[PDB]
Design a protein around this nucleic acid. Structure first.
Ligand SMILES: [Mg+2]
Length: 476
RNA sequence: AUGGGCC
RNA sequence: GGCCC
């Protein structure tokens, strides 16, 4: 986005500056080029001279202003994608009740009871549990009043800035490229779920290529559905973005909210408003109040869906800005936020699409960096989606999500105190697709120390998950 | 150390 | 409690 105002109000938003992540027994064995991101300016691992809280916001390098002609085309692509989207999902997008927003509904998980509260509830020493009854699904006086303000459309707020405590490639930890988390007031997240909760639940249920969204999918069982789909096309592209979230221009966001969340589609008038509040935001980091125009907050209730929707429109826009007579059936794509996989039978020139994505403020580059640019002829087994490859399982013939051995090694190298055992079992679900030999090697360091699931058991669990009949017929 | 997803 | 974005 574009930093338009930097202030120094006399109230610290003390940030958390000590990692919960610690090396495991595997760290000594795998020696990964990874490590927990820097949370403090006084981190010895940082490069001398690097000011953490200057690199954090360095991602905001402006807010691209689209011309009248470009804006007209974008609206035309937004409406077209919306048409497809609401054609599959339906028009049942009525506001969720205060109760359903908290407890959640079929296709939508419940709100986190004990996580960050936001402002100014943090400055007043209050957790979420004090403002909202997460059991019965009722709200306190504070939220109550705020919700009314949002109905009147007069509600203002500030985004709390959090240092994302996670494992990152050493080079970026040493550069100070710590990702940031935009914590929004709990009432804002609640109301957003009230406005578009029904819709989000529908997208999750109807995930797939036809709506261009993988949000809500289960890689275990859906890699077969996505795999056989893309394997039918001549060309498959693995496109990457740089600062996808931050580079959403205000023009694009506004038009997207206006075209997708119209009342005629079964939405509440305030569905469009609440989303537009994400466009112009004020961020509170310690003593500095930074006003940002453009970009998308990280802590939004539907950040992933918003990013995915945009991603779909961007592609349609870029293709229509370069070629003539481009429609939604000219290509196919699956998206999860900034993660994207495109496919088509036409020999599209993605390298030529570069300047067209720039008109949106986005910068595109080919995933694999062996080729100096986008190339044709790639298939589904060449690309990567959700940090997973598309590999064929010889025993079943189905596609299986396989993560790189380095990634898994990095994942198993670090863990937060007292959760090692529960993580191992979770990672085993990811590793199992790397084969018996690789699975065995990765968990070697943990043998005797923790319970490790047998490759056999997790393989059998998978076969039934992806196709029960196949597991049933296997007992002919 | 957060939003949504999935086990 | 983990992973993904
Ligand atoms: Mg990719």
């Amino acid at each position: 986005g574009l930093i338009v105002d930097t202030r120094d109000v006399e109230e610290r938003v003390h940030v958390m500056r000590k990692t919960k992540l610690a090396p495991t027994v595997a760290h000594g064995v795998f020696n990964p080029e990874f490590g927990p991101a820097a949370l403090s300016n006084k981190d010895p691992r940082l490069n001398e001279g690097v000011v953490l809280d200057e690199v954090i916001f360095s991602k905001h390098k402006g807010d691209t202003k689209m011309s009248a002609e470009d804006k007209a085309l974008f609206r035309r692509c937004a409406a077209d994608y919306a048409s497809r989207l609401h054609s599959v999902l339906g028009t049942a997008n009525a506001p969720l009740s205060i109760y359903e927003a908290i407890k959640g509904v079929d296709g939508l998980d419940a709100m986190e009871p004990d996580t960050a509260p936001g402002l100014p509830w943090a400055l007043q020493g209050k957790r979420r549990g004090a403002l909202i009854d997460f059991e019965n699904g009722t709200v306190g006086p504070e939220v109550e009043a705020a919700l009314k303000l949002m109905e009147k459309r007069e509600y203002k707020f500030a985004c709390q800035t959090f240092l994302k405590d996670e494992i990152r490639p050493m080079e970026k930890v040493r550069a100070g490229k710590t990702r940031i988390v935009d914590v929004l007031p709990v009432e804002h997240i609640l109301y957003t779920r009230m406005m578009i909760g029904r819709f989000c639940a529908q997208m999750h249920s109807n995930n797939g290529p036809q709506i261009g969204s993988a949000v809500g999918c289960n890689p275990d069982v859906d890699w077969q559905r996505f795999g056989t789909h893309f394997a039918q096309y001549r060309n498959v592209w693995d496109v990457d973005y740089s600062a996808f979230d931050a580079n959403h221009c205000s023009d694009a966001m506004n038009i997207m909210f206006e075209e997708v969340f119209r009342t005629e589609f079964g939405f509440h008038p305030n569905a469009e408003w609440i989303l537009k509040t994400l466009v112009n935001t004020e961020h509170a980091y310690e003593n500095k109040r930074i006003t940002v125009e453009g970009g998308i907050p990280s802590g939004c209730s539907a950040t992933s869906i918003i990013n995915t929707i945009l991603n779909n429109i961007y592609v349609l826009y870029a293709l229509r800005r370069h070629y003539e007579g481009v429609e939604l059936d000219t290509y196919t794509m699956i998206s999860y936020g900034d993660d994207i996989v495109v496919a088509s039978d036409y020999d599209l020139d993605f390298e030529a699409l570069k300047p067209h994505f720039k008109s949106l403020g986005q910068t595109i580059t080919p995933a694999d960096k062996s080729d100096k640019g986008f190339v044709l002829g790639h298939s589904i087994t060449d690309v990567t989606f959700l940090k997973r490859h598309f590999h064929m399982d010889y025993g079943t013939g189905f596609y299986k999500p396989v993560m790189a051995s380095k990634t898994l090694e990095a994942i198993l190298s670090f863990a937060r105190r007292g959760t090692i055992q529960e993580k191992l079992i979770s990672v085993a679900g990811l590793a199992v697709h790397s084969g018996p030999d690789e699975y065995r090697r990765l968990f070697e360091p943990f043998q005797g120390l923790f319970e490790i699931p047998s490759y056999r058991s997790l393989y059998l669990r998978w076969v039934n998950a992806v196709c029960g009949d196949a597991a049933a017929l296997e007992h002919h």
